[PDB]
Amino acid sequence: TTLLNPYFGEFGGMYVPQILMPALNQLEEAFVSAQKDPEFQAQFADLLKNYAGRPTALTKCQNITAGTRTTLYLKREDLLHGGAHKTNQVLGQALLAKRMGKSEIIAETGAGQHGVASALASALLGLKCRIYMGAKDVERQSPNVFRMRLMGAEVIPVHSGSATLKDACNEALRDWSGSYETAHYMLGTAAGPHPYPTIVREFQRMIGEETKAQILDKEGRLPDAVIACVGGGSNAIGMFADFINDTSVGLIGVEPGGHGIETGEHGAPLKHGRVGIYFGMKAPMMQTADGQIEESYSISAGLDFPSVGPQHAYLNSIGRADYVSITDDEALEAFKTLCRHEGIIPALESSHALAHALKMMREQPEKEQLLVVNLSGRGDKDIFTVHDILKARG
Amino acid sequence: TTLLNPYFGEFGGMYVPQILMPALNQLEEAFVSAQKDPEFQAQFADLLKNYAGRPTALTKCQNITAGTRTTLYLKREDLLHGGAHKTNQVLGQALLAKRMGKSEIIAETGAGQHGVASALASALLGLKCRIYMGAKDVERQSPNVFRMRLMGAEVIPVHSGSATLKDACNEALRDWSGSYETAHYMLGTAAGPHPYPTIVREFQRMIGEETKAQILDKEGRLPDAVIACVGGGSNAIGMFADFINDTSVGLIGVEPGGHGIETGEHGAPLKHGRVGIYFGMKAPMMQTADGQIEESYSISAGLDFPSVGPQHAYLNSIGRADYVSITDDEALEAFKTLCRHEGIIPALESSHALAHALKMMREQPEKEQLLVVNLSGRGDKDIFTVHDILKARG
Amino acid sequence: MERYENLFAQLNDRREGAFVPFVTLGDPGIEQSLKIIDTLIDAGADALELGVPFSDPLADGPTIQNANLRAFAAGVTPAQCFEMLALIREKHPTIPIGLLMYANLVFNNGIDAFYARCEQVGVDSVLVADVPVEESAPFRQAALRHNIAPIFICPPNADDDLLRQVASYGRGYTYLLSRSGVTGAENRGALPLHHLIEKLKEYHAAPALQGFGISSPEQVSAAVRAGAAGAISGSAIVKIIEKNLASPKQMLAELRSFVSAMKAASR
Amino acid sequence: MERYENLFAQLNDRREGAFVPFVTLGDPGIEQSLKIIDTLIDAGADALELGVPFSDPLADGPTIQNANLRAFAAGVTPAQCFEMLALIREKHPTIPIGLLMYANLVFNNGIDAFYARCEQVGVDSVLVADVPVEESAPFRQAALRHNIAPIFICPPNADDDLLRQVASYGRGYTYLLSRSGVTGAENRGALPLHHLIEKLKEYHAAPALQGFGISSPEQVSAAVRAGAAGAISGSAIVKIIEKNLASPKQMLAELRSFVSAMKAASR
Ligand SMILES: O=P(O)(O)OCCNS(=O)(=O)c1ccc(OC(F)(F)F)cc1
Numbered sequence A, B: 001t002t003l004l005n006p007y008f009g010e011f012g013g014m015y016v017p018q019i020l021m022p023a024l025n026q027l028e029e030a031f032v033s034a035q036k037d038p039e040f041q042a043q044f045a046d047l048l049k050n051y052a053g054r055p056t057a058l059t060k061c062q063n064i065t066a067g068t069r070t071t072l073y074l075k076r077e078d079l080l081h082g083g084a085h086k087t088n089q090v091l092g093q094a095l096l097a098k099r100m101g102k103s104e105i106i107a108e109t110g111a112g113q114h115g116v117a118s119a120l121a122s123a124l125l126g127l128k129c130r131i132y133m134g135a136k137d138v139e140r141q142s143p144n145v146f147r148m149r150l151m152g153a154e155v156i157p158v159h160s161g162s163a164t165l166k167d168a169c170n171e172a173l174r175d176w177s178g179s180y181e182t183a184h185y186m187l188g189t190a191a192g193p194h195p196y197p198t199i200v201r202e203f204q205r206m207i208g209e210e211t212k213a214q215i216l217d218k219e220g221r222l223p224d225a226v227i228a229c230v231g232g233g234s235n236a237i238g239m240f241a242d243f244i245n246d247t248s249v250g251l252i253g254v255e256p257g258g259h260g261i262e263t264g265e266h267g268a269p270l271k272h273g274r275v276g277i278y279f280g281m282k283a284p285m286m287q288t289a290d291g292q293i294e295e296s297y298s299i300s301a302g303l304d305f306p307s308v309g310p311q312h313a314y315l316n317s318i319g320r321a322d323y324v325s326i327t328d329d330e331a332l333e334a335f336k337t338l339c340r341h342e343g344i345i346p347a348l349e350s351s352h353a354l355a356h357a358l359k360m361m362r363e364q365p366e367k368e369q370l371l372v373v374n375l376s377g378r379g380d381k382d383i384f385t386v387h388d389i390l391k392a393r394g
Numbered sequence C, D: 001m002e003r004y005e006n007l008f009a010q011l012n013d014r015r016e017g018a019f020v021p022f023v024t025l026g027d028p029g030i031e032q033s034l035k036i037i038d039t040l041i042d043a044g045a046d047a048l049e050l051g052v053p054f055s056d057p058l059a060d061g062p063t064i065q066n067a068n069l070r071a072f073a074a075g076v077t078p079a080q081c082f083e084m085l086a087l088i089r090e091k092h093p094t095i096p097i098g099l100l101m102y103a104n105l106v107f108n109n110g111i112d113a114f115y116a117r118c119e120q121v122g123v124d125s126v127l128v129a130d131v132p133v134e135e136s137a138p139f140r141q142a143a144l145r146h147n148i149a150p151i152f153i154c155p156p157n158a159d160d161d162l163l164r165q166v167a168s169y170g171r172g173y174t175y176l177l178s179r180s181g182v183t184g185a186e187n188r189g190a191l192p193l194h195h196l197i198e199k200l201k202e203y204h205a206a207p208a209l210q211g212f213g214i215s216s217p218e219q220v221s222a223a224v225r226a227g228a229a230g231a232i233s234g235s236a237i238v239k240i241i242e243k244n245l246a247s248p249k250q251m252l253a254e255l256r257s258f259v260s261a262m263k264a265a266s267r
């Protein structure tokens, strides 16, 4: 029994061990309560404004689109404290943990950005934070591991399974199954068991709310399409949510195509995986023919979640949103182009959304279109990745 | 003959080769014109808002001050596009270059932040940018050198003299002395020959203007003191300027004390150097007993300018502002404390201002004081410096 | 078939509890695992719980995480598991065989087809670890269509609604969890709440087997004394595998000694 | 003293221009620099321009930047420069000696004291490279109090106000810059604007010496033909030092040959 619907059509649900059902029910109740509580809303609004830096800018990119009929705005989540959109919803989740009387936070992370966002929210709000990270990721993400440690978080390497994000996801749930009475699990994307896809969406929806107000102010109309990269789905659902009922507005989600869909080396389960049940939900995922869970590959280490939020799978099924993929090489070109023509270094994740917008423009340069890309994060973290490629190729 | 006063009391002036006088006179005229031009003002305001992310937040830091009578706010220049205050004035200077019909930008940089700010402004605004950087700095600042190159800037190593910031300053002026007809010199701090100290102040003064409005809104009164680190003086003068006529508001500038003033290994020429003439101005500087110019030492590579803006020397001389120093170890402790208690990673430069505020609080914990620290930049760039120390000491 | 019903009736006739070991199929290889399973049976196991190796076993502690990893190191697949299961049943006709599954392996290529393959190989029950009663409908229905008992979990804090659900929906046995957390011998659970045991009997639930943290004979006798029909032990058995990888002979000897002691405690 | 006035009068009597080499004092060492300077004089230099090594020579191109660096590698200080200057003047009583200074070395320990030390060692003029006429007042006043000519720079684009200022404030000679940019033989300047040369004469300015980029005899004769009193050459002389560091004997030979040719072009 729940207060809210745990499904988006056939997708979603609460596929957790019986022992965790009360933790999910408790979380849902606290969320529903918080959402009607003007003091909760005001406290969240205050942190977002005065600590995280909202509202974020909406930047018109004139150099990139010169000579075409595309007008392109970037929603600047790269300017949020922490350097990515993840900060929005960890602040809301930290406040929910406090509302429930929890003193401890558990978080999973792959590339480390969610780990850093959870650590900074926990430091601000007086929560003791422990973060699980696959041992291969810990090895590859020293900068973020050290940021988490400077912020007072305990970073716990996970050596089981493939020692990456999915294995950290498991370990977080194993810990929670024994510690839920005192600890909140701060899940990092719009995925997992209900109520997380709903909570994560509602605590990211200011992205699209502000986008709508900002584009009405500048252009006097809604965008033709809003475009966002999709790892687990949080920044994309955050941009999409306030436009879902504006049926003229295209919603375009961009999954990583890695080395190319046909190579198998990609992270695009929504369009190229198979529905399974894992991490608390029924959703498309990266899996073997036998049903073992596999890794998502992308040049961008943050597009590593091996499935996709269930609301995205649902929006796709009904044709409300369209999903596409962009390869490593397309994302790298979009990265280089934004640096050179706009002086903004985008996260390689976000560079997937930008690459697809650039393609929309370049393929049909006399189509009149007003586009918004969600620039989900900054790309300072990616400059050596892009370096080790770009000079090793000229 | 000039339109504006080139001196702040005895400090400042225009000590450049005769050949560069017309370039300075042209720049001053264009500045004076721009400052009365509402279209210039609107274009600058628009870039600051929609591209750089102004206004920046003013964050109340409650965990740090618990149990004392200090209330501490941080002005969040760390949230500006580029990750430091330098972005404000490069956008104004780029617009002045365009107003004068210049197509090229020359900039100097030490640690690289000004180089990156100049490169991003030049990329946005269609200017061809060349940046001089001492060869020792180029070697030590790969991340920033690569950001400049991704943004399309030409980075030119300087091998003369000590191959650091002052040598890059010289080379920029050598180039300008031959190229001023087509190139603007985008100087990086509130120092150098007139009109730069004045221009840099006016294109940073939104820091203190917003601070004043934000603190009136939250607290209903002015701060007791505003505290800022001082390398060449831009972020500090930017914070101070709008408070200079509010005589109840303390203005505290914090120079780097390095290993300690008594070691000689510091960057605090305002209080511990000797007045000289160099880089176009009469100001306190780091110099040998014979008058050779020396380097400023700090753990923070951005507090390396070996002199100080002349308006700071003047505000000190009349007793309007007070200047102090903070050592490497004090700045490192303030860095660690902000990470752990507020979830904000401050630039090691800014950590000097924060250390001095922490000292104001800790020395007199029952003194009622409302303080604002200018958090001039983010400290992602410093996490390995702090690492290589903090574990090599526990 | 009625293998759990027949077992419990027999055990009740001998005033005896069930002792039920868990092992991962194919750990540390198919041939050794077949031998391990035969040794457990010869030493007095009343029934078996058998894990199919899964990449993401999120209800398992390190001991069983490592059992899954060993089986994957040996190339063990669900198809090979079903071959093993068919052979085990051909050797031992009456022992109840329960699978410990994760949802994706059941749902993967059709829930109905999964329970049909279970029936064909002679499996008696399936416990899908990450499907709570709230999500169980297509699993339990498919289980029952194919004469397989769907096993449900009764947490130590179960409220009345949940007890009534577990009692109505389950068959074969009711899994009584000894505590929160994940599998592991390093974490001992509670005595069964006599309240839960009695409410389950009140609602004519399938007989209860206590599991999680059962690693000693005293715990087995304690479960039975509290009113449970028996006790399951997994990590304690798998730890004997892990400890003796280098010595298959000693492994089987220690397995036999442990199972015999645990089964003796049920009498 | 009146050394430049006496020189120009003598040169005018011989219908001759001045040839004035620049070198950095103490490059590549004190003893060799003393020899270099004696060689320049013996070969026909009419006057000398002498740089005091400074850490930040922002009006100098690479050739002279490297001259400063060599002198610093030899430990050359302003005090040693003043010792050198006193010796040079003791050997050569009439040759005009001009210093090329940067402001901080003049201001360092008092502007007045600096010009007093110049007078004591017998220096005739001082050109402070980073002090424009607009900032020159305390420099020129101190220069004149101590019988030292303050030298000012007339850029090739000088407007009337600036020409009048350079004419009124300067003494000794007026520095006529051949182009914008910094010192260096790799960048040739223009013919003197005959307009500037004539306006300077109109305003009774000190006689003009053209400098920057003068590296060949043809340029010397061209300066004099345009109405300048002479020509200064720095980088071209310093390049001979740089090229011949390994061979002091050849260095002095090439210096002598170059200076002789350049001086011959002034006749
Ligand atoms: O002795 P231990 O502590 O290793 O526990 C033995 C458990 N093995 S099992 O197959 O019964 C078993 C039963 C239920 C499980 O998870 C669930 F409760 F969520 F469904 C996991 C394993």
Ligand SMILES: O=P(O)(O)OCCNS(=O)(=O)c1ccc(OC(F)(F)F)cc1
Residues within 6 Å of the ligand: B017, B018, B019, D022, D049, D050, D059, D060, D064, D100, D127, D128, D129, D130, D153, D177, D182, D183, D184, D185, D211, D212, D213, D214, D232, D233, D234, D235, D236
């Ligand atoms: O032959 P070059 O091209 O090396 O030029 C020789 C110049 N040496 S100098 O002492 O006259 C000399 C004169 C003026 C200078 O700068 C200033 F104009 F800004 F004042 C610098 C050097």
Ligand SMILES: *Cc1c(COP(=O)(O)O)cnc(C)c1O
Residues within 6 Å of the ligand: A084, A085, A086, A113, A114, A188, A189, A190, A229, A230, A231, A232, A233, A234, A235, A236, A302, A303, A347, A349, A350, A376, A377, A378
């Ligand atoms: C982690 C990350 C993503 C992908 O996660 P979503 O939940 O799909 O938003 C995208 N952009 C950035 C900058 C990230 O750090």
Ligand SMILES: *Cc1c(COP(=O)(O)O)cnc(C)c1O
Residues within 6 Å of the ligand: B084, B085, B086, B113, B114, B188, B189, B190, B229, B230, B231, B232, B233, B234, B235, B236, B302, B303, B347, B349, B350, B376, B377, B378
């Ligand atoms: C460069 C820098 C400074 C010092 O320069 P000022 O001109 O004194 O402001 C201070 N803070 C940060 C973050 C910098 O990058």
Ligand SMILES: [N+]
Residues within 6 Å of the ligand: A230, A231, A232, A255, A256, A266, A267, A268, A269, A296, A303, A304, A305, A306, A307
């Ligand atoms: N993915």
Ligand SMILES: [N+]
Residues within 6 Å of the ligand: B230, B231, B232, B255, B256, B266, B267, B268, B269, B296, B303, B304, B305, B306, B307
């Ligand atoms: N400094």
